[PDB]
PDB file of C-alpha atoms and ligand atoms in Angstrom:
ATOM      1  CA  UNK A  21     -13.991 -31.595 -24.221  1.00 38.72           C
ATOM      2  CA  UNK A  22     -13.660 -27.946 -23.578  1.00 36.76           C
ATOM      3  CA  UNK A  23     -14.233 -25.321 -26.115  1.00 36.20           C
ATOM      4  CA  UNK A  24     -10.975 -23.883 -25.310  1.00 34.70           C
ATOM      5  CA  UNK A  25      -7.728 -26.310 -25.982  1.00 31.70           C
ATOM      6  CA  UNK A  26      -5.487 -24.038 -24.233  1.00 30.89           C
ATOM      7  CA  UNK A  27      -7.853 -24.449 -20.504  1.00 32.59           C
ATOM      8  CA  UNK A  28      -5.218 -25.948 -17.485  1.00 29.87           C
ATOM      9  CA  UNK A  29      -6.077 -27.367 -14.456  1.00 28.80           C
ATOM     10  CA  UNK A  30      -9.751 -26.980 -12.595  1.00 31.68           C
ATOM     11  CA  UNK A  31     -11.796 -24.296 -12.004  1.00 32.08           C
ATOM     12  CA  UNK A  32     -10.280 -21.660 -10.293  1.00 29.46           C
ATOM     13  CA  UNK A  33     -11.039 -20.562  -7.079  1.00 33.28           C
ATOM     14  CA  UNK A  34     -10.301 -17.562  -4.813  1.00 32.56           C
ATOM     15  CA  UNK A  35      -8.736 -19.854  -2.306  1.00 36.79           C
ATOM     16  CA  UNK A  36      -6.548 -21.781  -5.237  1.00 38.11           C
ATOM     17  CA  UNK A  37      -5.600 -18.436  -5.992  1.00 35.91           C
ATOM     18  CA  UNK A  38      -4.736 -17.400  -2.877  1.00 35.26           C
ATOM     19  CA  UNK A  39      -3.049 -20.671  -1.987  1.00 35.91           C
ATOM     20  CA  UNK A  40       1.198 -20.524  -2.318  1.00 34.29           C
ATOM     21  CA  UNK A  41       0.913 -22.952  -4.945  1.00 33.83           C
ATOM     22  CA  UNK A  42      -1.288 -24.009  -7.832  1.00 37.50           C
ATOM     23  CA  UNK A  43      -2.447 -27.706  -9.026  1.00 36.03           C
ATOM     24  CA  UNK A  44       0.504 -28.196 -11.116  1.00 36.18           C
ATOM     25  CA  UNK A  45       3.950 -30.137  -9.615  1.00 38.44           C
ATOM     26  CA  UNK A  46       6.747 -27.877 -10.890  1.00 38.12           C
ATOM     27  CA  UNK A  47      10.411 -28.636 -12.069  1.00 39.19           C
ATOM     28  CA  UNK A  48      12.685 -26.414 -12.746  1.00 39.18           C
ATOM     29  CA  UNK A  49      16.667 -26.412 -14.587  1.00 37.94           C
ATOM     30  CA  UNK A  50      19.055 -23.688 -15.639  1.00 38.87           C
ATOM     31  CA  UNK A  51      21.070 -21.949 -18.155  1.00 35.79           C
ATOM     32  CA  UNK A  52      24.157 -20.208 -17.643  1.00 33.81           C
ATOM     33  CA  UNK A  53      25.322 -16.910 -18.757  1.00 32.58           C
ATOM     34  CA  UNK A  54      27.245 -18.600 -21.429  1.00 29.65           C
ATOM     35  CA  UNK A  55      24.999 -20.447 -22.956  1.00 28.70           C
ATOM     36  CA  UNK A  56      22.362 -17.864 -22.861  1.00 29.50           C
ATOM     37  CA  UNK A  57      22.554 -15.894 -25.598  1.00 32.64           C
ATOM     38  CA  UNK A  58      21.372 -12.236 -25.469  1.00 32.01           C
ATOM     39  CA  UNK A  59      20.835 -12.351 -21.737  1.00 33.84           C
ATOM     40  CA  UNK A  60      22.221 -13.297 -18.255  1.00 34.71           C
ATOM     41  CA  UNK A  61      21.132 -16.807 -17.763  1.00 34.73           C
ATOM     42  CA  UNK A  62      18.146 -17.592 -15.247  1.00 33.30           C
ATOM     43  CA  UNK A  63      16.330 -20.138 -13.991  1.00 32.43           C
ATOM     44  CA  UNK A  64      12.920 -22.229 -15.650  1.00 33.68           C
ATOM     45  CA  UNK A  65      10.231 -23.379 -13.870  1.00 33.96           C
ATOM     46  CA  UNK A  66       7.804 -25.839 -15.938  1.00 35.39           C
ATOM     47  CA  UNK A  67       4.883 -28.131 -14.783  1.00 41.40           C
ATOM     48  CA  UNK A  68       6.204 -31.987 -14.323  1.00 37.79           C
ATOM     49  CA  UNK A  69       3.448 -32.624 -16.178  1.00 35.45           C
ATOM     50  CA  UNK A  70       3.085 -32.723 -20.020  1.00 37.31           C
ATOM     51  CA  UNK A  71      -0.687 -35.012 -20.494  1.00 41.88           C
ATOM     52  CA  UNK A  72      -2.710 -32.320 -21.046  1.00 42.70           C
ATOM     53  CA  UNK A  73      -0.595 -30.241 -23.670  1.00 47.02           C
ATOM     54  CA  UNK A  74       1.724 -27.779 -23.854  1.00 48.52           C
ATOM     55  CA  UNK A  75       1.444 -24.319 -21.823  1.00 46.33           C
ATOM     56  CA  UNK A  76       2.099 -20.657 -22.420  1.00 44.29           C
ATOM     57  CA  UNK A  77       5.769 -19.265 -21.559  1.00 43.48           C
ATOM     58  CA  UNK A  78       7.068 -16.066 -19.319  1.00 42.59           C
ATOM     59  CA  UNK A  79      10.034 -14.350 -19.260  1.00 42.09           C
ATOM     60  CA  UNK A  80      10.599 -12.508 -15.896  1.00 43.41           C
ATOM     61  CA  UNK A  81      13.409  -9.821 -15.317  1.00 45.20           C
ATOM     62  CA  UNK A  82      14.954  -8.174 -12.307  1.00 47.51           C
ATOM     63  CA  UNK A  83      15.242  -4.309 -11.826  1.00 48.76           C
ATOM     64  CA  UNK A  84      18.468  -1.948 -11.143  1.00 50.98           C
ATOM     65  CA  UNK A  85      21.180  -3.498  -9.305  1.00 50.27           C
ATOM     66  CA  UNK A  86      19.198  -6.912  -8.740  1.00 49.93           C
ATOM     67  CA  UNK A  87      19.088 -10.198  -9.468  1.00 50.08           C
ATOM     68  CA  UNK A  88      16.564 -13.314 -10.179  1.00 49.44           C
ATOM     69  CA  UNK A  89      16.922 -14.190  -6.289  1.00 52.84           C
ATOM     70  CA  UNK A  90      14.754 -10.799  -6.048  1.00 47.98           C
ATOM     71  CA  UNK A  91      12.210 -12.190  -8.270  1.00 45.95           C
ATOM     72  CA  UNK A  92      12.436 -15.982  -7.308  1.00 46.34           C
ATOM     73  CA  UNK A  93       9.383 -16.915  -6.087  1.00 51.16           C
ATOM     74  CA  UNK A  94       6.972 -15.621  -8.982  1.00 51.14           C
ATOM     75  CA  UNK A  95       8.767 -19.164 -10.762  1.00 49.84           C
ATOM     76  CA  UNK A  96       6.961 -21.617  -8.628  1.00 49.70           C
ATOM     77  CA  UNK A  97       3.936 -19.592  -8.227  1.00 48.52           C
ATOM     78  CA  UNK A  98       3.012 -18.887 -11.765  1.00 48.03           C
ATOM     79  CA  UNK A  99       4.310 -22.141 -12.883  1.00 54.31           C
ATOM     80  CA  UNK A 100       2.539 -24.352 -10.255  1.00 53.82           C
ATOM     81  CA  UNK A 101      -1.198 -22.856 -12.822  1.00 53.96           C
ATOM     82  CA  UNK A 102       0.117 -24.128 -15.942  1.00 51.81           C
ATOM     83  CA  UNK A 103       3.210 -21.896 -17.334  1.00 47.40           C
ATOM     84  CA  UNK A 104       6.913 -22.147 -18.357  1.00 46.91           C
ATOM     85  CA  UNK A 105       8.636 -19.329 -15.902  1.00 45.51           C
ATOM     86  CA  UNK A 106      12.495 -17.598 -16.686  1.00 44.81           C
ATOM     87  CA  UNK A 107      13.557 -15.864 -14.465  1.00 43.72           C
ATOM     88  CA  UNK A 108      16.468 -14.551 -15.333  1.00 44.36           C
ATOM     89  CA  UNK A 109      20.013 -12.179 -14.852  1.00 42.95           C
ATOM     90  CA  UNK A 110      20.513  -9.586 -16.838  1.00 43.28           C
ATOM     91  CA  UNK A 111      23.721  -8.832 -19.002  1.00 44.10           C
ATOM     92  CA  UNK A 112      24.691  -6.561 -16.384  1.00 45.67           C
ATOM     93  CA  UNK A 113      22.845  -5.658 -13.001  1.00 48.32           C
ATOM     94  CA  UNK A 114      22.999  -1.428 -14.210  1.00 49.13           C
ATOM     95  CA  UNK A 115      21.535  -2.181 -17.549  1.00 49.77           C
ATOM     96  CA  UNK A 116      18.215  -0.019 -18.317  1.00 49.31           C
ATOM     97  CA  UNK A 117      14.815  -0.701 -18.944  1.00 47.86           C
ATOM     98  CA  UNK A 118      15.641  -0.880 -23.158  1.00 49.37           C
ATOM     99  CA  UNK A 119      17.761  -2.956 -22.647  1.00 48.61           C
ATOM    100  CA  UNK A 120      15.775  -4.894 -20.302  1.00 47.00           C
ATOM    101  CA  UNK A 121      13.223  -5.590 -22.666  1.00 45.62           C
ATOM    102  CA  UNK A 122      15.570  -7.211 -25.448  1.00 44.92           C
ATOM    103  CA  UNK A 123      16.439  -9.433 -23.123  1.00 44.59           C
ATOM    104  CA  UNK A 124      13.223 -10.498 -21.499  1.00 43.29           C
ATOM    105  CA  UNK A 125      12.514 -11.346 -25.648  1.00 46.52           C
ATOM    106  CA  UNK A 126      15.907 -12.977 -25.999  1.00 47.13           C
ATOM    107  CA  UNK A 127      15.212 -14.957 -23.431  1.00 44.72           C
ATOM    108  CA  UNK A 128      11.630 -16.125 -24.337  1.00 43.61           C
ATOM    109  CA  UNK A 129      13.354 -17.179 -27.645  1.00 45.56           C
ATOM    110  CA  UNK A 130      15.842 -19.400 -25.868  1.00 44.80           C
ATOM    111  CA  UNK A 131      12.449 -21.131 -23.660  1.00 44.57           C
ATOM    112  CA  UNK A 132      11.061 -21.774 -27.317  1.00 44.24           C
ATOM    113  CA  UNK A 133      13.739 -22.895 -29.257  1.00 46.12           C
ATOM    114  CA  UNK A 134      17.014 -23.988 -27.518  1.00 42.05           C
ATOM    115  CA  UNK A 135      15.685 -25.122 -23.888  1.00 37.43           C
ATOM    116  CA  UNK A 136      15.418 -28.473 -22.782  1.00 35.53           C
ATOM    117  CA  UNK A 137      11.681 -28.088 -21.901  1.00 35.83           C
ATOM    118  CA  UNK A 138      10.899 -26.253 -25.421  1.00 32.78           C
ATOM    119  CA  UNK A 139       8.328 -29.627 -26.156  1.00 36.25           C
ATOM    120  CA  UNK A 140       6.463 -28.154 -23.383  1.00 36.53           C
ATOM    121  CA  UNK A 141       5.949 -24.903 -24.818  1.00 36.29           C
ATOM    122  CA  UNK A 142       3.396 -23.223 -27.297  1.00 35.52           C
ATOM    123  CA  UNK A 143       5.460 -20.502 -28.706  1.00 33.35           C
ATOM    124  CA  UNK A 144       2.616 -18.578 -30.000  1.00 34.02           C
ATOM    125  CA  UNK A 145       1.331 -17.885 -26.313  1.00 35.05           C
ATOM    126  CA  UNK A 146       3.939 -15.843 -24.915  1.00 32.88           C
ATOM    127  CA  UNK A 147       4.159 -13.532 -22.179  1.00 32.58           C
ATOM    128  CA  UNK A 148       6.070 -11.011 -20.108  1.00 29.05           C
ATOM    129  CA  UNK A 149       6.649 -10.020 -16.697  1.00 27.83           C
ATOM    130  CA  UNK A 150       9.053  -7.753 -14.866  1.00 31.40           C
ATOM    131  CA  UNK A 151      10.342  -5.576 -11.282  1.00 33.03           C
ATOM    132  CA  UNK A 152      11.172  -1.860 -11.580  1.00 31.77           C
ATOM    133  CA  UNK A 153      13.505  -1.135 -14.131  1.00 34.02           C
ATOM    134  CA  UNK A 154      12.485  -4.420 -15.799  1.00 31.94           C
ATOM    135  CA  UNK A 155       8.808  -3.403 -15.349  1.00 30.22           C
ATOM    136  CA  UNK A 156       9.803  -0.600 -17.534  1.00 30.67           C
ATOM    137  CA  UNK A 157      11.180  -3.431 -19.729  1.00 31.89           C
ATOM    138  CA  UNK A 158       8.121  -5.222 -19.953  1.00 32.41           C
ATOM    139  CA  UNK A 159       6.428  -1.994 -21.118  1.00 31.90           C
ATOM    140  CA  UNK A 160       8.620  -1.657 -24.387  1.00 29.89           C
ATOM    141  CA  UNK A 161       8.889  -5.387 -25.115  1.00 34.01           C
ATOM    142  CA  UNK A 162       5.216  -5.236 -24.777  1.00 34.15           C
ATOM    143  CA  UNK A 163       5.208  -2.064 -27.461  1.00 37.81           C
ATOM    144  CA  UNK A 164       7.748  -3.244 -29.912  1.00 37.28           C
ATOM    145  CA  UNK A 165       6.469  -6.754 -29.770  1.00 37.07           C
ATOM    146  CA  UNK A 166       2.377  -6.810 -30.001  1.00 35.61           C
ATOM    147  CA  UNK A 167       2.517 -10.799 -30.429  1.00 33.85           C
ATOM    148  CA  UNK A 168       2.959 -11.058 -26.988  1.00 34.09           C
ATOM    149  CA  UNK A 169      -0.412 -12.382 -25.162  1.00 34.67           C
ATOM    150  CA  UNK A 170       0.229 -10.508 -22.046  1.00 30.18           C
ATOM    151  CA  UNK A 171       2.331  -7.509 -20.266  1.00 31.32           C
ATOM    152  CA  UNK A 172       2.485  -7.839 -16.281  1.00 32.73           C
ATOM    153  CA  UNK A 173       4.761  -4.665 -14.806  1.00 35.17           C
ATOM    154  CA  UNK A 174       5.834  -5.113 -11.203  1.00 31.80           C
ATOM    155  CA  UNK A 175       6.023  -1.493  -9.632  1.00 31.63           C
ATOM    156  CA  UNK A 176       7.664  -0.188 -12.939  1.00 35.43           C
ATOM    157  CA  UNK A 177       9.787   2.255 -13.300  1.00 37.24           C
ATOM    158  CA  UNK A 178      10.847   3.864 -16.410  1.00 37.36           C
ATOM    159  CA  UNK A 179      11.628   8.032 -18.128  1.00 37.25           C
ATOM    160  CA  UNK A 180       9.190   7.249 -21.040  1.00 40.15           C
ATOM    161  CA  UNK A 181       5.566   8.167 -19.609  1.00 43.23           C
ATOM    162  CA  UNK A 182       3.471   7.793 -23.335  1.00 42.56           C
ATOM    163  CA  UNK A 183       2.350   4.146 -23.789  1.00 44.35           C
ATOM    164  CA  UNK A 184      -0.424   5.001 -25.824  1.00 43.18           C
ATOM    165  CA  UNK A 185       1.157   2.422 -28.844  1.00 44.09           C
ATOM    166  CA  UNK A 186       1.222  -0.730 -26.633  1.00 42.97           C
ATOM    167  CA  UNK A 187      -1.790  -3.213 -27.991  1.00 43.27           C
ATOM    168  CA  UNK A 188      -0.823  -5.905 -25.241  1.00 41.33           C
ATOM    169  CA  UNK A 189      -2.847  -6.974 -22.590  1.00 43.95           C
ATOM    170  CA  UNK A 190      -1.169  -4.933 -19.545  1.00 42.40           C
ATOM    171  CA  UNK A 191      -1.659  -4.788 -16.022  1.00 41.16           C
ATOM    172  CA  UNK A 192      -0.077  -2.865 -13.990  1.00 43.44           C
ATOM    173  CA  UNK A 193       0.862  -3.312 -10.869  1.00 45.75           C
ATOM    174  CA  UNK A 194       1.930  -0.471  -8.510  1.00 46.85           C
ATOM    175  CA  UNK A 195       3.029   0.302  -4.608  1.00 45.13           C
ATOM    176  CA  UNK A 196       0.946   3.400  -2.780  1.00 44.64           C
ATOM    177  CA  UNK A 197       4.076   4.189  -0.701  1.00 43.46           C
ATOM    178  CA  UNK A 198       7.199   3.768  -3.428  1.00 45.66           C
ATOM    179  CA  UNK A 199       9.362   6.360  -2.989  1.00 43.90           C
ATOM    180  CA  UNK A 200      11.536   4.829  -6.047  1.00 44.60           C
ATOM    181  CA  UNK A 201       9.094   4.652  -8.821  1.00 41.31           C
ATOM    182  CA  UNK A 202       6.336   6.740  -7.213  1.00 43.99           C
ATOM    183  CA  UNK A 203       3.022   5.586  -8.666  1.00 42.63           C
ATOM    184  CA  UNK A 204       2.312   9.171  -9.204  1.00 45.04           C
ATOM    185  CA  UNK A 205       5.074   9.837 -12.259  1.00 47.94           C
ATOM    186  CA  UNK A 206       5.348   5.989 -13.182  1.00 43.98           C
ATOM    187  CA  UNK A 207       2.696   3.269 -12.620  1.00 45.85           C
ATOM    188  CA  UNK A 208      -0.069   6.232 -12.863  1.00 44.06           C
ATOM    189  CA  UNK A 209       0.907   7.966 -15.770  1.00 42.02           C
ATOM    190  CA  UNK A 210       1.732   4.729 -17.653  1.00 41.72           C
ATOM    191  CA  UNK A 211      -1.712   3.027 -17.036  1.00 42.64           C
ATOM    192  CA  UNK A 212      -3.269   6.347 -17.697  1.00 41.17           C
ATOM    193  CA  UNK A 213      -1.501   6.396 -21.368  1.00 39.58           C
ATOM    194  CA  UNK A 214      -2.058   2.851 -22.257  1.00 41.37           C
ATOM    195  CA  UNK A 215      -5.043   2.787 -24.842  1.00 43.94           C
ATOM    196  CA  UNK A 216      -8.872   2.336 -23.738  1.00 44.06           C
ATOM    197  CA  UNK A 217      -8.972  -0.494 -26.470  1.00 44.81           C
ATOM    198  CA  UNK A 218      -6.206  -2.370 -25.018  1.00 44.76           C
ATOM    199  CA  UNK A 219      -7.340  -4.620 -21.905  1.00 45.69           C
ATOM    200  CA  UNK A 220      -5.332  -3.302 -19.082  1.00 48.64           C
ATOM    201  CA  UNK A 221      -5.420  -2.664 -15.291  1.00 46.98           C
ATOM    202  CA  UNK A 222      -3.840  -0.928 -12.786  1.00 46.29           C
ATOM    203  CA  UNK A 223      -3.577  -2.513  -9.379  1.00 45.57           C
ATOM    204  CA  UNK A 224      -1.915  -0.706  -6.265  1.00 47.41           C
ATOM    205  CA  UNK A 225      -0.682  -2.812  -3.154  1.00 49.48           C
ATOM    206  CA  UNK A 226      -2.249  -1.150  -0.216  1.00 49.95           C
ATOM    207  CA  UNK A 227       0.647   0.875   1.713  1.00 46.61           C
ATOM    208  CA  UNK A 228       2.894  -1.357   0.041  1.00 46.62           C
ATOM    209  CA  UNK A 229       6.861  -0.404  -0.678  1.00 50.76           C
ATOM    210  CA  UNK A 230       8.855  -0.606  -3.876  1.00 51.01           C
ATOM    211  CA  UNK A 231       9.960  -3.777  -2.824  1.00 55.37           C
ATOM    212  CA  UNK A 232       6.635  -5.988  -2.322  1.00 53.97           C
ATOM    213  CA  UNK A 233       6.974  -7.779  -5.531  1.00 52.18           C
ATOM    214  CA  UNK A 234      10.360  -9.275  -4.339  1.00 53.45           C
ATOM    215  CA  UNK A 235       8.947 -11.384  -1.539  1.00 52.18           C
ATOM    216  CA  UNK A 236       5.936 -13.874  -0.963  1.00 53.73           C
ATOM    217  CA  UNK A 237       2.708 -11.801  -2.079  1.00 53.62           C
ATOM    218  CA  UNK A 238      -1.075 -12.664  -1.835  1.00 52.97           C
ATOM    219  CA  UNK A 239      -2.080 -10.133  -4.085  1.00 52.38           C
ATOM    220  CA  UNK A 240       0.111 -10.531  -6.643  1.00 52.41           C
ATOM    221  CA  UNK A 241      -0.001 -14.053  -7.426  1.00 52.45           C
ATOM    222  CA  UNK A 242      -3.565 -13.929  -7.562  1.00 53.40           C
ATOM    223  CA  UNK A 243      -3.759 -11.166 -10.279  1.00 56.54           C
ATOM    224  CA  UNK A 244      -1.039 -12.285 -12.242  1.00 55.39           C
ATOM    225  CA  UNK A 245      -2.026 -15.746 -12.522  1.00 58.34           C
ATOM    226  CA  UNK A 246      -5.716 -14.653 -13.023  1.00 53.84           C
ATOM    227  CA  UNK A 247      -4.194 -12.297 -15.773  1.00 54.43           C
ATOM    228  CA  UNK A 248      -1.874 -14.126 -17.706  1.00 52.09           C
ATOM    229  CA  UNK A 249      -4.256 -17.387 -17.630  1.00 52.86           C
ATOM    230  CA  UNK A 250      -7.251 -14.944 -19.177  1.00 56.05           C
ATOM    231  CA  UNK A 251      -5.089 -13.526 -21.860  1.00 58.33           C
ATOM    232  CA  UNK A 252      -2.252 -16.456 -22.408  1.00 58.29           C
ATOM    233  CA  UNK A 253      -4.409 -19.266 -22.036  1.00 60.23           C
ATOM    234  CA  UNK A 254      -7.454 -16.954 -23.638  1.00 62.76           C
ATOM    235  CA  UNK A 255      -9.066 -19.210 -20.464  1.00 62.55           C
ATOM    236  CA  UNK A 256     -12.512 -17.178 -19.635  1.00 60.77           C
ATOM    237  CA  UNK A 257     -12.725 -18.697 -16.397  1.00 58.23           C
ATOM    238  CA  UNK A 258     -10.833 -16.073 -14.730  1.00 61.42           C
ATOM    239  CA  UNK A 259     -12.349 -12.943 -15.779  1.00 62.30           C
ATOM    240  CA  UNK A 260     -14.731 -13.678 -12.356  1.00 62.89           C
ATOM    241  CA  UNK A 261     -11.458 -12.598 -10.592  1.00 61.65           C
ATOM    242  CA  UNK A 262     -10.555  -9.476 -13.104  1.00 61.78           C
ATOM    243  CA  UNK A 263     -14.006  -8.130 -13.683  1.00 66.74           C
ATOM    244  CA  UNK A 264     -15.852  -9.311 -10.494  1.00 64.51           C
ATOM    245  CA  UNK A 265     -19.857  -8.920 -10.754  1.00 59.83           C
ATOM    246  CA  UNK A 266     -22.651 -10.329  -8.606  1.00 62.07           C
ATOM    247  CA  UNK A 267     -23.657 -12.301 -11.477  1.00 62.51           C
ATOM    248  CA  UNK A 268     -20.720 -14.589 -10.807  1.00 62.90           C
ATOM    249  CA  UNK A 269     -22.746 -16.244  -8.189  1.00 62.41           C
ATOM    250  CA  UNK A 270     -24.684 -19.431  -8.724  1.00 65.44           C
ATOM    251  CA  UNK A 271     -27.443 -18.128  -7.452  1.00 65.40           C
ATOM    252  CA  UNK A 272     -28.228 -15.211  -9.592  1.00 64.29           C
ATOM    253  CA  UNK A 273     -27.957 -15.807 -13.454  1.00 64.96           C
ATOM    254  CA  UNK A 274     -28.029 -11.968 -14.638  1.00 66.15           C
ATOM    255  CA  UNK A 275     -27.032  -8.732 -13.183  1.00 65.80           C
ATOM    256  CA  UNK A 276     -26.892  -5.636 -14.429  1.00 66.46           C
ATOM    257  CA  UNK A 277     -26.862  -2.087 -12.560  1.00 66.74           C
ATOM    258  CA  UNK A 278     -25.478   1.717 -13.449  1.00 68.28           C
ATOM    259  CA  UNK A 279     -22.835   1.382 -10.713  1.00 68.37           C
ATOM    260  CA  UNK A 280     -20.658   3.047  -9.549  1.00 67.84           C
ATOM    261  CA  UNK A 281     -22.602   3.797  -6.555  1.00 67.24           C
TER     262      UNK A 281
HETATM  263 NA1   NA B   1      24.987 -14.399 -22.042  1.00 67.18          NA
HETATM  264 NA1   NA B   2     -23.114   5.479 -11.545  1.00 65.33          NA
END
């Protein structure tokens, strides 16, 4: 048996990374505005499959003026490796990245305790993820709730630039060319404030636009599955992909160097 109860699936590779979708057949169901309480409803992607324990749960949210159809296909992807996905609608489509964060905990509350997949769930491993406004979101749930296991912010944007108090495991994900949260006075400045002790990253899309987390993206999937699988899953084997080394070859069994260089 493995060390590690919470390890899903087999050894990752770059390719299974890289692939649209992980090992893991996915289902997914609903819940309506109504019967969401403290959010907008959304829609939850689980694996099928239940034999080899429960998983970790995320709670994704949309930014200004948008809904979960903008955020869509992070359910399959993320929950095809071994996660319960929300996506879900905000209370309103104008409401700000505060408010956005209440509800991206609201609704990981309503995954652990009122959903019809909460059996499938370990509600101590809990995550969150968000777009723009509710990448800001993720930010402050991540700083007023330090239980989380991991903070993933899609091109975030948000007027608060100090995130030194966040003790989540963040990364960051920015877009060279935004012109709506400019990495320069968002994604920049928020890595750059997170602290040193905190495991945290900051990944920009090559001349990507604001709007490359709401489509189909290589990149992303692979470092967001990669991240919340080493922090939500505490699952080792995917630090290879985070903290690449030559040493991750099976050929060579120590490396060590003074790069950069
Ligand atoms: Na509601
Ligand atoms: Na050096």
């Amino acid at each position: 048996m493995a060390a590690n109860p919470y390890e899903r699936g087999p050894d990752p590779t770059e390719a299974s990374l890289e692939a649209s979708s992980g090992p893991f057949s996915v289902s997914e169901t609903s819940v309506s505005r109504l019967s969401a309480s403290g959010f907008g409803g959304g829609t939850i992607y689980y694996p099928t499959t239940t034999s080899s324990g429960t998983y970790g749960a995320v709670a994704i949210s949309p930014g200004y003026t948008a809904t979960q159809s903008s955020i869509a296909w992070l359910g399959p992807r993320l929950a095809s490796h071994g996660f319960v996905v929300i996506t879900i609608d905000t209370n309103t489509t104008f409401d700000q990245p505060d408010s956005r964060a209440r509800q991206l905990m609201a609704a990981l509350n309503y995954l652990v305790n009122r959903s019809s997949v909460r059996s499938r769930i370990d509600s101590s491993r809990l995550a969150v993820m968000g777009h723009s406004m509710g990448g800001g979101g993720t930010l402050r749930a991540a700083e007023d709730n330090p239980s989380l296991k991991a903070a993933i912010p899609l091109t975030p944007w948000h007027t608060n630039k100090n995130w030194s108090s966040v003790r989540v495991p963040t990364l960051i994900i920015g877009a060279e060319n935004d012109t709506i949260a400019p990495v320069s006075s968002h994604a920049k400045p928020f890595y750059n404030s997170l602290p040193s002790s905190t495991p945290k990253a900051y990944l920009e899309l090559n001349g990507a636009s604001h709007f490359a987390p709401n489509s189909s993206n290589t990149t992303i999937g692979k470092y967001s599955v990669s991240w919340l699988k080493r922090f939500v899953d505490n699952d080792t084997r995917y630090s290879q992909f985070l903290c690449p080394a030559p040493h991750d070859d099976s050929a060579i069994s120590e490396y060590r160097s003074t790069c950069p260089y």
